[PDB]
């Protein structure tokens, strides 16, 4: 239903909105999509992240 509503109607055609944001991965710039998960069992800072500061959507 959302894949048929994204096209819009037959008379007028809807604009194609891009999902996510064009971010830079280490320049390997990709269109990405953030999820946010709460894991109470990792506790490991031995993992490289893209950014250093948290940020809202």
């Amino acid at each position: 239903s959302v894949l048929e509503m994204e096209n819009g109607y037959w008379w007028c055609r809807r604009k194609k909105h891009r999902e996510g944001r064009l971010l830079k991965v280490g320049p390997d710039e990709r269109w990405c999509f953030r999820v946010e998960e709460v894991n109470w069992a990792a506790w490991e800072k031995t993992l490289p992240t893209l950014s250093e500061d948290p940020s809202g959507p």
């Binding site: 506790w43 800072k45 250093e52 500061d53 948290p54 940020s55 809202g56």
Partner: protein
């Protein structure tokens, strides 16, 4: 001397290039707690950048940076610097050292005047 050179050498963490820093602030009455040396995005102080880019448990240029802002004599202290953003209102470098799960950097922070409240 500019701000981003200080941010690059505090993100790499090597303690040599802060020599020439201290008297430079003493040349122009600057401090490490104003809006000129901290970012206008959130108020990220170079101490907070030092704890955010620590390597293998301890960033080697934190105690030189606390030594420099001990000898320069700021009216508002460096370890009690908090962000002024509406996203980070009150967030200190002690929260970064506790968040990065390192006893050594929070020990170096609270040994040098970090308020714990």
């Amino acid at each position: 001397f500019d701000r981003d050179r200080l941010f690059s050498v505090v993100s790499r963490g090597v303690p040599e290039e802060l020599t020439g820093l201290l008297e430079y602030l003493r040349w122009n009455s600057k401090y490490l707690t104003d809006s000129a040396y901290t970012e206008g995005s959130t108020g990220k102080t170079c101490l907070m950048k030092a704890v955010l880019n620590l390597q293998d448990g301890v960033n080697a240029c934190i105690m030189p940076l606390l030594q420099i802002d001990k000898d320069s004599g700021n009216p508002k202290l460096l370890v009690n610097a908090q962000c002024t953003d509406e996203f980070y209102q009150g967030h200190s470098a002690l929260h970064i050292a506790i968040e990065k799960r390192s006893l050594q950097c929070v020990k170096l922070l609270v040994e040098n005047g970090a308020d714990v409240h």
